[PDB]
Ligand binder design. Sequence first.
Ligand SMILES: [Ca+2]
Ligand SMILES: [Ca+2]
Ligand SMILES: [Mg+2]
Lengths: 198, 117, 280
Amino acid sequence: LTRSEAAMTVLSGHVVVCIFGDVSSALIGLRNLVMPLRASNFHYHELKHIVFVGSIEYLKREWETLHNFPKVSILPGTPLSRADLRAVNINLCDMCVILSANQNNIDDTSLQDKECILASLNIKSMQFDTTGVNIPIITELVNDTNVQFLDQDDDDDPDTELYLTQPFACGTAFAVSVLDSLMSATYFNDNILTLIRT
Amino acid sequence: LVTGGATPELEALIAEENALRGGYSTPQTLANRDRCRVAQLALLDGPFADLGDGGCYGDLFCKALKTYNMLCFGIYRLRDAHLSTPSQCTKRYVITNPPYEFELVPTDLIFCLMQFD
Amino acid sequence: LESVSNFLKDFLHKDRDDVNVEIVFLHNISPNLELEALFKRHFTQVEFYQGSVLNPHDLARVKIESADACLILANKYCADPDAEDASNIMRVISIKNYHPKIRIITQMLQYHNKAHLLNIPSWNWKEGDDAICLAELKLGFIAQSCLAQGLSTMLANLFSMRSFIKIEEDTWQKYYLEGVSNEMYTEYLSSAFVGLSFPTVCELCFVKLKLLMIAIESRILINPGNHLKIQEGTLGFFIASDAKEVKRAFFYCKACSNVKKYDSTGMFHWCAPKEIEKVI
Ligand SMILES: [Ca+2]
Ligand SMILES: [Ca+2]
Ligand SMILES: [Mg+2]
């Protein structure tokens, strides 16, 4: 797509995916996110549309595994562009998903989730003819201590565990560090990994 | 003063769309042009030029303000103009807010804010 | 050492009035012996506490919930302007997250990063959040030197606090320093000047009070016309030697056609988007 066709194509109940890709960034593997939405125990009229916003270079470095799926679209823009997020009907989606690929290349532990946090704040600071705070949003963070910047009404404490933090308790944030108990669970009960996988 | 106006309307437009968008002419648009513009003017010709050698900055400030709705915050004076001997150097320097008693020389430039027509 | 030394010279200058605002520094590096000596030379006005601005515990330690404002200095000479802007953005995010209602003054190297920052939900420019963009202000000052050469020097010298310096030599430097001794101030002006024209109060203030007015508080009006009458309770943007002189402005009572030519706001010229080869 581009600005024109994105704005005139009415979208509602869709999934908006915000990608901070780069030509040197690692491959996220968006196949694994698309396939559960595309599963066949949903009727075809019930399939939520998917649109990806991000660097066109990174989209043409991953599209080679996403061309057999329906209801998908690309918009070659910036996840932080207010014009793009307005053109994509962000206020009418069933989810916005924010992912970053530049997480391992840099080693600062401060700027790893800066783009995701800024995008989340920009989406929550939007005025619609309702505010942007009620939008359904999920973001993936590399550092668990960065979850304190996602919300402002909640009380922040570095000692507080991620599972106990308000944005995680609400399903607004997700980090790969919560999966570490799957080693122990899998070992004790060999069927649990397949029950979860299915 | 520095960006030639950036009112909250323009700061919203550049935050939402990140480009200047062209507008059709309106009476409010033609009213928004009235704001002063910074200027230099010469002291060797025009209505101010009777402030030749030995004039007072207070006289110039007063007549400019009284008659042209114009006032000066400084003189762009030639570096060597305070010397007795002629020099080929054309370099000047900023004198800010000088006394009413401050002395003019005919080769000078004046910083001021001027009206719109 | 140089950043704090320059900041304290301008904040604590004798040309301001008798302000007793305490300065509290928050930094995660232990100060070297020369910074500790600089803080000892300011022992009653400066306190330092070692911590990270990203830590809510440290923010509570420096009592940022009751501070009048928070100032965020930036590394202008950094190797990576993008990295510096990102770090400053993170600092602003952390401070606003701890306390949304804190006045934040920060330096921003670029203008797109400034646009990125102003989307923060707690970022309120009306309340007093000022992002001083260095590239923007410097390019604006250079452009004003294209309308009148020397105006970048004229503007820059109005902010730096400077005392009068005088020497016996007859040199261009004496006159230049005498001009440099003045800064731009702001204060409320006497009821004795309400009901008069702006040119009239300017020619009155000029040498009787020894004060020059550039503007007044339809709010911010640069050099008003002769048709504007001074509102009761207004403030004047004076240029003066110091703050204790502009007190006179208060303390006085007769002590003698479909063409899109412009932008949407009507403030800049505009044209259709030209191709790059057209203008090459
Ligand atoms: Ca929080
Ligand atoms: Ca001074
Ligand atoms: Mg103390």
